[PDB]
């Protein structure tokens, strides 16, 4: 515990971690017994880090006691945790500061514009008075070749007055349309201080989740996060309880691209994608279904990713080619791990004579900074030696109840209500595109208000762009509630099939748990999906039946029957 | 009151004519300076 505390304290010396108004709790959860009794904020942070490491130790002990499979928790896990903490803290602080600066610039620009329109109204009234006196003088003297010139000047200044009034009207309409953005930015700038207050605990929790919770399933990940949150609450360390882990560790653009990359729509899958993006050690993927390998292939397709295996005789040459040319590599069958990757996984690089050398066996190879490797396996039951567990970060692609229920609901909806399922897919695509468009428009509006030089009304291009952005935002929002109401009616239609999906999830998770009474009862998810497809499409009891509810009842009964018949 | 408007636009087109003449003079000076090239 002393060594972990010293490592954390030395590593986290670069981060701020300074909260002068920190209030020491009455019952401080002491983990390092030599921690000062009136601890600082930094000392409390490091104590929480050590506590996170110890909780991983205790979770592994609990899993081992229950007969489950555990992977060793090494000091490299702690190093990954503190590295992720530093990186996430710096990233979040920089993003928050930049966003606050942009919002302040926008609010100042809006206030300047309203002051400008006020002074422009004043100038308009000055202009009207001078025009009226000029016209009156011209008429009065014409009552009694040079006054034609000044009445032409009066007409020109009247055109100028009309232009000024048109600018006033256009600008005031624009500002009245910009009130919602102004108030939203005002609220966000006011809550900036609160967001800054709870950044250390949030980054600590996110880093711990990335570094540690990769191998465990949904229940144990939630238990670990709950334990860490309770400890931070006990230590009087502020963190946001409202924001989700996935939404905090990723943006909507990344999630949309991941969905485009055949990533399953699940919270656990999204967290696994986050780990696959923000990894410190090279990932070891455990996906029996094989979807994660396809996700990795699609994600790194533009970077020329190649697939090999440890059993392949071309593994060595493919590995050295990837190392030399900096190409992504995906190596399967990690249960046949080749120790030749040990210097690569440990990042034992030698920087001599302007060369970054990696020793691959007996030969030194110029390592390229863009090289990345992913180890994969389809067997969730493999046990790895502690060395390999230390050299990689585990990304376990387990099947969750929510994901299975959603998958079965989509499958039955497509099989029995194909029009409703097609409409559902189209609506999801349209909603994704619309939300992307709103995000892009909002960002472009901030950028346009930021990059403008001088005043908004000085150049009418800014006015035109702002009006176009507002009108496009309004129209896409209109499309948003339209697609939302039709999505709502689609959801009401599809809610009837929920009990069948729940039954399917329960049936599969009973199938997956038959292995506890006999080693021979090993069933994959593909077996249950084959059962489901047979019940849906190849059911002899659905020859002439067209009623939807009777078909659903037959489907449920035949699902139970076929599941038992095939498993038994 | 209406012929004032058209004499004003006549002086406006007078200004336009003066601008056209100035543009003509500057363009022809440029061309007579670009003869060698």
PDB file of N, CA and C in Angstrom, chain A residues 174-271:
ATOM      1  N   UNK A 174     -32.833  38.933 -35.712  1.00  0.00           N
ATOM      2  CA  UNK A 174     -31.820  37.913 -35.462  1.00  0.00           C
ATOM      3  C   UNK A 174     -31.551  37.753 -33.970  1.00  0.00           C
ATOM      4  N   UNK A 175     -31.402  38.869 -33.251  1.00  0.00           N
ATOM      5  CA  UNK A 175     -31.140  38.785 -31.816  1.00  0.00           C
ATOM      6  C   UNK A 175     -32.321  38.190 -31.062  1.00  0.00           C
ATOM      7  N   UNK A 176     -33.550  38.531 -31.457  1.00  0.00           N
ATOM      8  CA  UNK A 176     -34.701  37.903 -30.823  1.00  0.00           C
ATOM      9  C   UNK A 176     -34.761  36.413 -31.126  1.00  0.00           C
ATOM     10  N   UNK A 177     -34.243  35.987 -32.279  1.00  0.00           N
ATOM     11  CA  UNK A 177     -34.129  34.562 -32.566  1.00  0.00           C
ATOM     12  C   UNK A 177     -32.974  33.901 -31.823  1.00  0.00           C
ATOM     13  N   UNK A 178     -31.985  34.673 -31.376  1.00  0.00           N
ATOM     14  CA  UNK A 178     -30.804  34.143 -30.707  1.00  0.00           C
ATOM     15  C   UNK A 178     -30.942  34.114 -29.190  1.00  0.00           C
ATOM     16  N   UNK A 179     -32.127  34.420 -28.657  1.00  0.00           N
ATOM     17  CA  UNK A 179     -32.291  34.486 -27.208  1.00  0.00           C
ATOM     18  C   UNK A 179     -32.081  33.123 -26.557  1.00  0.00           C
ATOM     19  N   UNK A 180     -32.573  32.057 -27.193  1.00  0.00           N
ATOM     20  CA  UNK A 180     -32.437  30.722 -26.616  1.00  0.00           C
ATOM     21  C   UNK A 180     -30.975  30.317 -26.493  1.00  0.00           C
ATOM     22  N   UNK A 181     -30.182  30.560 -27.538  1.00  0.00           N
ATOM     23  CA  UNK A 181     -28.754  30.270 -27.458  1.00  0.00           C
ATOM     24  C   UNK A 181     -28.085  31.113 -26.384  1.00  0.00           C
ATOM     25  N   UNK A 182     -28.468  32.386 -26.276  1.00  0.00           N
ATOM     26  CA  UNK A 182     -27.862  33.258 -25.275  1.00  0.00           C
ATOM     27  C   UNK A 182     -28.129  32.745 -23.866  1.00  0.00           C
ATOM     28  N   UNK A 183     -29.375  32.358 -23.579  1.00  0.00           N
ATOM     29  CA  UNK A 183     -29.689  31.883 -22.234  1.00  0.00           C
ATOM     30  C   UNK A 183     -29.053  30.523 -21.959  1.00  0.00           C
ATOM     31  N   UNK A 184     -29.004  29.643 -22.964  1.00  0.00           N
ATOM     32  CA  UNK A 184     -28.346  28.353 -22.775  1.00  0.00           C
ATOM     33  C   UNK A 184     -26.864  28.535 -22.472  1.00  0.00           C
ATOM     34  N   UNK A 185     -26.200  29.418 -23.220  1.00  0.00           N
ATOM     35  CA  UNK A 185     -24.783  29.671 -22.994  1.00  0.00           C
ATOM     36  C   UNK A 185     -24.554  30.333 -21.643  1.00  0.00           C
ATOM     37  N   UNK A 186     -25.464  31.221 -21.235  1.00  0.00           N
ATOM     38  CA  UNK A 186     -25.363  31.836 -19.917  1.00  0.00           C
ATOM     39  C   UNK A 186     -25.445  30.784 -18.819  1.00  0.00           C
ATOM     40  N   UNK A 187     -26.406  29.865 -18.931  1.00  0.00           N
ATOM     41  CA  UNK A 187     -26.549  28.808 -17.935  1.00  0.00           C
ATOM     42  C   UNK A 187     -25.317  27.911 -17.902  1.00  0.00           C
ATOM     43  N   UNK A 188     -24.790  27.557 -19.075  1.00  0.00           N
ATOM     44  CA  UNK A 188     -23.615  26.692 -19.115  1.00  0.00           C
ATOM     45  C   UNK A 188     -22.394  27.390 -18.522  1.00  0.00           C
ATOM     46  N   UNK A 189     -22.219  28.680 -18.813  1.00  0.00           N
ATOM     47  CA  UNK A 189     -21.105  29.416 -18.228  1.00  0.00           C
ATOM     48  C   UNK A 189     -21.259  29.558 -16.720  1.00  0.00           C
ATOM     49  N   UNK A 190     -22.498  29.620 -16.224  1.00  0.00           N
ATOM     50  CA  UNK A 190     -22.697  29.656 -14.779  1.00  0.00           C
ATOM     51  C   UNK A 190     -22.385  28.307 -14.138  1.00  0.00           C
ATOM     52  N   UNK A 191     -22.748  27.207 -14.799  1.00  0.00           N
ATOM     53  CA  UNK A 191     -22.464  25.883 -14.251  1.00  0.00           C
ATOM     54  C   UNK A 191     -21.044  25.410 -14.545  1.00  0.00           C
ATOM     55  N   UNK A 192     -20.257  26.210 -15.267  1.00  0.00           N
ATOM     56  CA  UNK A 192     -18.856  25.869 -15.511  1.00  0.00           C
ATOM     57  C   UNK A 192     -18.090  25.641 -14.213  1.00  0.00           C
ATOM     58  N   UNK A 193     -18.332  26.468 -13.194  1.00  0.00           N
ATOM     59  CA  UNK A 193     -17.614  26.305 -11.931  1.00  0.00           C
ATOM     60  C   UNK A 193     -17.951  24.974 -11.272  1.00  0.00           C
ATOM     61  N   UNK A 194     -19.235  24.606 -11.266  1.00  0.00           N
ATOM     62  CA  UNK A 194     -19.636  23.319 -10.711  1.00  0.00           C
ATOM     63  C   UNK A 194     -19.023  22.170 -11.502  1.00  0.00           C
ATOM     64  N   UNK A 195     -18.994  22.292 -12.832  1.00  0.00           N
ATOM     65  CA  UNK A 195     -18.388  21.250 -13.654  1.00  0.00           C
ATOM     66  C   UNK A 195     -16.899  21.111 -13.357  1.00  0.00           C
ATOM     67  N   UNK A 196     -16.211  22.234 -13.151  1.00  0.00           N
ATOM     68  CA  UNK A 196     -14.800  22.190 -12.778  1.00  0.00           C
ATOM     69  C   UNK A 196     -14.601  21.564 -11.405  1.00  0.00           C
ATOM     70  N   UNK A 197     -15.547  21.769 -10.487  1.00  0.00           N
ATOM     71  CA  UNK A 197     -15.406  21.234  -9.137  1.00  0.00           C
ATOM     72  C   UNK A 197     -15.386  19.708  -9.121  1.00  0.00           C
ATOM     73  N   UNK A 198     -16.258  19.068  -9.896  1.00  0.00           N
ATOM     74  CA  UNK A 198     -16.411  17.619  -9.869  1.00  0.00           C
ATOM     75  C   UNK A 198     -15.645  16.914 -10.981  1.00  0.00           C
ATOM     76  N   UNK A 199     -14.529  17.479 -11.440  1.00  0.00           N
ATOM     77  CA  UNK A 199     -13.815  16.867 -12.555  1.00  0.00           C
ATOM     78  C   UNK A 199     -12.818  15.815 -12.073  1.00  0.00           C
ATOM     79  N   UNK A 200     -12.221  16.008 -10.895  1.00  0.00           N
ATOM     80  CA  UNK A 200     -11.206  15.075 -10.416  1.00  0.00           C
ATOM     81  C   UNK A 200     -11.812  13.712 -10.109  1.00  0.00           C
ATOM     82  N   UNK A 201     -12.929  13.690  -9.381  1.00  0.00           N
ATOM     83  CA  UNK A 201     -13.567  12.423  -9.066  1.00  0.00           C
ATOM     84  C   UNK A 201     -14.102  11.716 -10.297  1.00  0.00           C
ATOM     85  N   UNK A 202     -14.679  12.476 -11.229  1.00  0.00           N
ATOM     86  CA  UNK A 202     -15.190  11.882 -12.459  1.00  0.00           C
ATOM     87  C   UNK A 202     -14.066  11.256 -13.273  1.00  0.00           C
ATOM     88  N   UNK A 203     -12.944  11.970 -13.411  1.00  0.00           N
ATOM     89  CA  UNK A 203     -11.817  11.416 -14.151  1.00  0.00           C
ATOM     90  C   UNK A 203     -11.224  10.208 -13.435  1.00  0.00           C
ATOM     91  N   UNK A 204     -11.180  10.239 -12.101  1.00  0.00           N
ATOM     92  CA  UNK A 204     -10.694   9.086 -11.349  1.00  0.00           C
ATOM     93  C   UNK A 204     -11.563   7.863 -11.605  1.00  0.00           C
ATOM     94  N   UNK A 205     -12.885   8.035 -11.529  1.00  0.00           N
ATOM     95  CA  UNK A 205     -13.794   6.916 -11.759  1.00  0.00           C
ATOM     96  C   UNK A 205     -13.676   6.388 -13.182  1.00  0.00           C
ATOM     97  N   UNK A 206     -13.611   7.288 -14.165  1.00  0.00           N
ATOM     98  CA  UNK A 206     -13.510   6.854 -15.553  1.00  0.00           C
ATOM     99  C   UNK A 206     -12.203   6.115 -15.812  1.00  0.00           C
ATOM    100  N   UNK A 207     -11.093   6.625 -15.273  1.00  0.00           N
ATOM    101  CA  UNK A 207      -9.807   5.963 -15.451  1.00  0.00           C
ATOM    102  C   UNK A 207      -9.792   4.595 -14.787  1.00  0.00           C
ATOM    103  N   UNK A 208     -10.366   4.491 -13.586  1.00  0.00           N
ATOM    104  CA  UNK A 208     -10.440   3.196 -12.921  1.00  0.00           C
ATOM    105  C   UNK A 208     -11.269   2.214 -13.735  1.00  0.00           C
ATOM    106  N   UNK A 209     -12.396   2.674 -14.283  1.00  0.00           N
ATOM    107  CA  UNK A 209     -13.232   1.794 -15.091  1.00  0.00           C
ATOM    108  C   UNK A 209     -12.495   1.321 -16.338  1.00  0.00           C
ATOM    109  N   UNK A 210     -11.778   2.225 -17.008  1.00  0.00           N
ATOM    110  CA  UNK A 210     -11.052   1.837 -18.213  1.00  0.00           C
ATOM    111  C   UNK A 210      -9.940   0.849 -17.880  1.00  0.00           C
ATOM    112  N   UNK A 211      -9.185   1.111 -16.813  1.00  0.00           N
ATOM    113  CA  UNK A 211      -8.011   0.299 -16.521  1.00  0.00           C
ATOM    114  C   UNK A 211      -8.356  -1.045 -15.894  1.00  0.00           C
ATOM    115  N   UNK A 212      -9.470  -1.144 -15.176  1.00  0.00           N
ATOM    116  CA  UNK A 212      -9.721  -2.321 -14.354  1.00  0.00           C
ATOM    117  C   UNK A 212     -10.923  -3.144 -14.787  1.00  0.00           C
ATOM    118  N   UNK A 213     -12.042  -2.507 -15.119  1.00  0.00           N
ATOM    119  CA  UNK A 213     -13.307  -3.208 -15.297  1.00  0.00           C
ATOM    120  C   UNK A 213     -13.448  -3.879 -16.656  1.00  0.00           C
ATOM    121  N   UNK A 214     -12.362  -4.025 -17.413  1.00  0.00           N
ATOM    122  CA  UNK A 214     -12.480  -4.571 -18.757  1.00  0.00           C
ATOM    123  C   UNK A 214     -12.898  -6.029 -18.781  1.00  0.00           C
ATOM    124  N   UNK A 215     -12.287  -6.848 -17.925  1.00  0.00           N
ATOM    125  CA  UNK A 215     -12.503  -8.289 -17.991  1.00  0.00           C
ATOM    126  C   UNK A 215     -13.843  -8.711 -17.401  1.00  0.00           C
ATOM    127  N   UNK A 216     -14.357  -7.970 -16.427  1.00  0.00           N
ATOM    128  CA  UNK A 216     -15.540  -8.394 -15.699  1.00  0.00           C
ATOM    129  C   UNK A 216     -16.803  -8.153 -16.525  1.00  0.00           C
ATOM    130  N   UNK A 217     -17.890  -8.792 -16.103  1.00  0.00           N
ATOM    131  CA  UNK A 217     -19.170  -8.671 -16.783  1.00  0.00           C
ATOM    132  C   UNK A 217     -19.933  -7.466 -16.234  1.00  0.00           C
ATOM    133  N   UNK A 218     -21.189  -7.309 -16.660  1.00  0.00           N
ATOM    134  CA  UNK A 218     -21.959  -6.116 -16.317  1.00  0.00           C
ATOM    135  C   UNK A 218     -22.140  -5.978 -14.809  1.00  0.00           C
ATOM    136  N   UNK A 219     -22.508  -7.074 -14.141  1.00  0.00           N
ATOM    137  CA  UNK A 219     -22.794  -7.010 -12.711  1.00  0.00           C
ATOM    138  C   UNK A 219     -21.557  -6.618 -11.914  1.00  0.00           C
ATOM    139  N   UNK A 220     -20.408  -7.216 -12.228  1.00  0.00           N
ATOM    140  CA  UNK A 220     -19.205  -6.917 -11.461  1.00  0.00           C
ATOM    141  C   UNK A 220     -18.647  -5.541 -11.800  1.00  0.00           C
ATOM    142  N   UNK A 221     -18.779  -5.102 -13.054  1.00  0.00           N
ATOM    143  CA  UNK A 221     -18.407  -3.733 -13.397  1.00  0.00           C
ATOM    144  C   UNK A 221     -19.236  -2.734 -12.601  1.00  0.00           C
ATOM    145  N   UNK A 222     -20.549  -2.969 -12.522  1.00  0.00           N
ATOM    146  CA  UNK A 222     -21.409  -2.077 -11.755  1.00  0.00           C
ATOM    147  C   UNK A 222     -21.058  -2.109 -10.275  1.00  0.00           C
ATOM    148  N   UNK A 223     -20.762  -3.295  -9.737  1.00  0.00           N
ATOM    149  CA  UNK A 223     -20.382  -3.393  -8.331  1.00  0.00           C
ATOM    150  C   UNK A 223     -19.094  -2.628  -8.050  1.00  0.00           C
ATOM    151  N   UNK A 224     -18.099  -2.764  -8.929  1.00  0.00           N
ATOM    152  CA  UNK A 224     -16.840  -2.050  -8.746  1.00  0.00           C
ATOM    153  C   UNK A 224     -17.051  -0.543  -8.803  1.00  0.00           C
ATOM    154  N   UNK A 225     -17.828  -0.076  -9.785  1.00  0.00           N
ATOM    155  CA  UNK A 225     -18.072   1.358  -9.898  1.00  0.00           C
ATOM    156  C   UNK A 225     -18.841   1.881  -8.692  1.00  0.00           C
ATOM    157  N   UNK A 226     -19.809   1.107  -8.197  1.00  0.00           N
ATOM    158  CA  UNK A 226     -20.551   1.509  -7.008  1.00  0.00           C
ATOM    159  C   UNK A 226     -19.641   1.593  -5.791  1.00  0.00           C
ATOM    160  N   UNK A 227     -18.729   0.630  -5.640  1.00  0.00           N
ATOM    161  CA  UNK A 227     -17.794   0.664  -4.519  1.00  0.00           C
ATOM    162  C   UNK A 227     -16.898   1.894  -4.589  1.00  0.00           C
ATOM    163  N   UNK A 228     -16.374   2.192  -5.781  1.00  0.00           N
ATOM    164  CA  UNK A 228     -15.526   3.370  -5.937  1.00  0.00           C
ATOM    165  C   UNK A 228     -16.300   4.652  -5.653  1.00  0.00           C
ATOM    166  N   UNK A 229     -17.544   4.733  -6.133  1.00  0.00           N
ATOM    167  CA  UNK A 229     -18.359   5.919  -5.893  1.00  0.00           C
ATOM    168  C   UNK A 229     -18.657   6.092  -4.410  1.00  0.00           C
ATOM    169  N   UNK A 230     -18.957   4.994  -3.712  1.00  0.00           N
ATOM    170  CA  UNK A 230     -19.187   5.080  -2.274  1.00  0.00           C
ATOM    171  C   UNK A 230     -17.936   5.540  -1.541  1.00  0.00           C
ATOM    172  N   UNK A 231     -16.764   5.047  -1.950  1.00  0.00           N
ATOM    173  CA  UNK A 231     -15.533   5.496  -1.307  1.00  0.00           C
ATOM    174  C   UNK A 231     -15.289   6.979  -1.546  1.00  0.00           C
ATOM    175  N   UNK A 232     -15.528   7.454  -2.771  1.00  0.00           N
ATOM    176  CA  UNK A 232     -15.325   8.873  -3.048  1.00  0.00           C
ATOM    177  C   UNK A 232     -16.325   9.736  -2.288  1.00  0.00           C
ATOM    178  N   UNK A 233     -17.560   9.253  -2.129  1.00  0.00           N
ATOM    179  CA  UNK A 233     -18.525   9.963  -1.296  1.00  0.00           C
ATOM    180  C   UNK A 233     -18.062  10.014   0.152  1.00  0.00           C
ATOM    181  N   UNK A 234     -17.519   8.904   0.653  1.00  0.00           N
ATOM    182  CA  UNK A 234     -17.038   8.857   2.027  1.00  0.00           C
ATOM    183  C   UNK A 234     -15.824   9.754   2.233  1.00  0.00           C
ATOM    184  N   UNK A 235     -15.051  10.002   1.179  1.00  0.00           N
ATOM    185  CA  UNK A 235     -13.849  10.819   1.258  1.00  0.00           C
ATOM    186  C   UNK A 235     -14.107  12.283   0.929  1.00  0.00           C
ATOM    187  N   UNK A 236     -15.372  12.673   0.757  1.00  0.00           N
ATOM    188  CA  UNK A 236     -15.746  14.054   0.443  1.00  0.00           C
ATOM    189  C   UNK A 236     -15.084  14.534  -0.846  1.00  0.00           C
ATOM    190  N   UNK A 237     -15.077  13.672  -1.859  1.00  0.00           N
ATOM    191  CA  UNK A 237     -14.544  13.998  -3.176  1.00  0.00           C
ATOM    192  C   UNK A 237     -15.722  14.109  -4.132  1.00  0.00           C
ATOM    193  N   UNK A 238     -15.830  15.249  -4.805  1.00  0.00           N
ATOM    194  CA  UNK A 238     -17.008  15.548  -5.607  1.00  0.00           C
ATOM    195  C   UNK A 238     -16.909  14.895  -6.980  1.00  0.00           C
ATOM    196  N   UNK A 239     -17.994  14.245  -7.395  1.00  0.00           N
ATOM    197  CA  UNK A 239     -18.095  13.652  -8.719  1.00  0.00           C
ATOM    198  C   UNK A 239     -19.550  13.702  -9.158  1.00  0.00           C
ATOM    199  N   UNK A 240     -19.762  13.684 -10.471  1.00  0.00           N
ATOM    200  CA  UNK A 240     -21.110  13.754 -11.022  1.00  0.00           C
ATOM    201  C   UNK A 240     -21.735  12.365 -11.027  1.00  0.00           C
ATOM    202  N   UNK A 241     -22.886  12.233 -10.372  1.00  0.00           N
ATOM    203  CA  UNK A 241     -23.618  10.976 -10.332  1.00  0.00           C
ATOM    204  C   UNK A 241     -24.615  10.840 -11.478  1.00  0.00           C
ATOM    205  N   UNK A 242     -24.954  11.940 -12.150  1.00  0.00           N
ATOM    206  CA  UNK A 242     -25.992  11.933 -13.174  1.00  0.00           C
ATOM    207  C   UNK A 242     -25.498  11.432 -14.528  1.00  0.00           C
ATOM    208  N   UNK A 243     -24.275  11.790 -14.920  1.00  0.00           N
ATOM    209  CA  UNK A 243     -23.799  11.467 -16.260  1.00  0.00           C
ATOM    210  C   UNK A 243     -23.403   9.998 -16.335  1.00  0.00           C
ATOM    211  N   UNK A 244     -23.700   9.372 -17.471  1.00  0.00           N
ATOM    212  CA  UNK A 244     -23.353   7.979 -17.698  1.00  0.00           C
ATOM    213  C   UNK A 244     -21.872   7.840 -18.040  1.00  0.00           C
ATOM    214  N   UNK A 245     -21.344   6.637 -17.806  1.00  0.00           N
ATOM    215  CA  UNK A 245     -19.938   6.371 -18.094  1.00  0.00           C
ATOM    216  C   UNK A 245     -19.648   6.492 -19.584  1.00  0.00           C
ATOM    217  N   UNK A 246     -20.491   5.873 -20.415  1.00  0.00           N
ATOM    218  CA  UNK A 246     -20.267   5.895 -21.856  1.00  0.00           C
ATOM    219  C   UNK A 246     -20.379   7.306 -22.413  1.00  0.00           C
ATOM    220  N   UNK A 247     -21.375   8.067 -21.958  1.00  0.00           N
ATOM    221  CA  UNK A 247     -21.549   9.429 -22.449  1.00  0.00           C
ATOM    222  C   UNK A 247     -20.424  10.342 -21.980  1.00  0.00           C
ATOM    223  N   UNK A 248     -19.854  10.068 -20.805  1.00  0.00           N
ATOM    224  CA  UNK A 248     -18.744  10.878 -20.319  1.00  0.00           C
ATOM    225  C   UNK A 248     -17.441  10.541 -21.030  1.00  0.00           C
ATOM    226  N   UNK A 249     -17.232   9.274 -21.383  1.00  0.00           N
ATOM    227  CA  UNK A 249     -15.976   8.841 -21.981  1.00  0.00           C
ATOM    228  C   UNK A 249     -15.995   8.833 -23.502  1.00  0.00           C
ATOM    229  N   UNK A 250     -17.100   9.227 -24.129  1.00  0.00           N
ATOM    230  CA  UNK A 250     -17.161   9.276 -25.582  1.00  0.00           C
ATOM    231  C   UNK A 250     -18.146  10.355 -26.005  1.00  0.00           C
ATOM    232  N   UNK A 251     -17.990  10.815 -27.242  1.00  0.00           N
ATOM    233  CA  UNK A 251     -18.902  11.781 -27.833  1.00  0.00           C
ATOM    234  C   UNK A 251     -19.845  11.081 -28.805  1.00  0.00           C
ATOM    235  N   UNK A 252     -20.901  11.798 -29.193  1.00  0.00           N
ATOM    236  CA  UNK A 252     -21.923  11.205 -30.047  1.00  0.00           C
ATOM    237  C   UNK A 252     -21.378  10.841 -31.421  1.00  0.00           C
ATOM    238  N   UNK A 253     -20.391  11.590 -31.918  1.00  0.00           N
ATOM    239  CA  UNK A 253     -19.801  11.262 -33.213  1.00  0.00           C
ATOM    240  C   UNK A 253     -19.080   9.920 -33.172  1.00  0.00           C
ATOM    241  N   UNK A 254     -18.309   9.675 -32.109  1.00  0.00           N
ATOM    242  CA  UNK A 254     -17.631   8.391 -31.964  1.00  0.00           C
ATOM    243  C   UNK A 254     -18.629   7.249 -31.874  1.00  0.00           C
ATOM    244  N   UNK A 255     -19.697   7.431 -31.097  1.00  0.00           N
ATOM    245  CA  UNK A 255     -20.699   6.380 -30.970  1.00  0.00           C
ATOM    246  C   UNK A 255     -21.394   6.118 -32.300  1.00  0.00           C
ATOM    247  N   UNK A 256     -21.710   7.176 -33.049  1.00  0.00           N
ATOM    248  CA  UNK A 256     -22.336   6.998 -34.356  1.00  0.00           C
ATOM    249  C   UNK A 256     -21.417   6.249 -35.312  1.00  0.00           C
ATOM    250  N   UNK A 257     -20.130   6.603 -35.326  1.00  0.00           N
ATOM    251  CA  UNK A 257     -19.185   5.887 -36.179  1.00  0.00           C
ATOM    252  C   UNK A 257     -19.066   4.428 -35.757  1.00  0.00           C
ATOM    253  N   UNK A 258     -19.087   4.167 -34.448  1.00  0.00           N
ATOM    254  CA  UNK A 258     -19.024   2.792 -33.962  1.00  0.00           C
ATOM    255  C   UNK A 258     -20.241   1.993 -34.415  1.00  0.00           C
ATOM    256  N   UNK A 259     -21.432   2.595 -34.338  1.00  0.00           N
ATOM    257  CA  UNK A 259     -22.615   1.933 -34.883  1.00  0.00           C
ATOM    258  C   UNK A 259     -22.466   1.678 -36.376  1.00  0.00           C
ATOM    259  N   UNK A 260     -21.861   2.618 -37.107  1.00  0.00           N
ATOM    260  CA  UNK A 260     -21.582   2.375 -38.518  1.00  0.00           C
ATOM    261  C   UNK A 260     -20.569   1.251 -38.707  1.00  0.00           C
ATOM    262  N   UNK A 261     -19.760   0.966 -37.682  1.00  0.00           N
ATOM    263  CA  UNK A 261     -18.758  -0.094 -37.730  1.00  0.00           C
ATOM    264  C   UNK A 261     -19.267  -1.410 -37.155  1.00  0.00           C
ATOM    265  N   UNK A 262     -20.579  -1.646 -37.206  1.00  0.00           N
ATOM    266  CA  UNK A 262     -21.197  -2.895 -36.752  1.00  0.00           C
ATOM    267  C   UNK A 262     -20.889  -3.188 -35.285  1.00  0.00           C
ATOM    268  N   UNK A 263     -20.840  -2.144 -34.468  1.00  0.00           N
ATOM    269  CA  UNK A 263     -20.763  -2.348 -33.025  1.00  0.00           C
ATOM    270  C   UNK A 263     -22.164  -2.577 -32.470  1.00  0.00           C
ATOM    271  N   UNK A 264     -22.386  -3.650 -31.712  1.00  0.00           N
ATOM    272  CA  UNK A 264     -23.728  -3.906 -31.175  1.00  0.00           C
ATOM    273  C   UNK A 264     -24.204  -2.763 -30.291  1.00  0.00           C
ATOM    274  N   UNK A 265     -25.505  -2.491 -30.356  1.00  0.00           N
ATOM    275  CA  UNK A 265     -26.119  -1.409 -29.589  1.00  0.00           C
ATOM    276  C   UNK A 265     -26.313  -1.885 -28.156  1.00  0.00           C
ATOM    277  N   UNK A 266     -25.292  -1.673 -27.331  1.00  0.00           N
ATOM    278  CA  UNK A 266     -25.330  -2.086 -25.938  1.00  0.00           C
ATOM    279  C   UNK A 266     -24.386  -1.198 -25.142  1.00  0.00           C
ATOM    280  N   UNK A 267     -24.716  -0.998 -23.865  1.00  0.00           N
ATOM    281  CA  UNK A 267     -23.861  -0.186 -23.005  1.00  0.00           C
ATOM    282  C   UNK A 267     -22.527  -0.873 -22.745  1.00  0.00           C
ATOM    283  N   UNK A 268     -22.548  -2.189 -22.515  1.00  0.00           N
ATOM    284  CA  UNK A 268     -21.304  -2.921 -22.306  1.00  0.00           C
ATOM    285  C   UNK A 268     -20.434  -2.892 -23.555  1.00  0.00           C
ATOM    286  N   UNK A 269     -21.049  -3.038 -24.732  1.00  0.00           N
ATOM    287  CA  UNK A 269     -20.289  -2.956 -25.976  1.00  0.00           C
ATOM    288  C   UNK A 269     -19.711  -1.562 -26.178  1.00  0.00           C
ATOM    289  N   UNK A 270     -20.463  -0.524 -25.806  1.00  0.00           N
ATOM    290  CA  UNK A 270     -19.947   0.837 -25.914  1.00  0.00           C
ATOM    291  C   UNK A 270     -18.766   1.056 -24.975  1.00  0.00           C
ATOM    292  N   UNK A 271     -18.853   0.541 -23.746  1.00  0.00           N
ATOM    293  CA  UNK A 271     -17.721   0.631 -22.829  1.00  0.00           C
ATOM    294  C   UNK A 271     -16.517  -0.126 -23.373  1.00  0.00           C
TER     295      UNK A 271
END
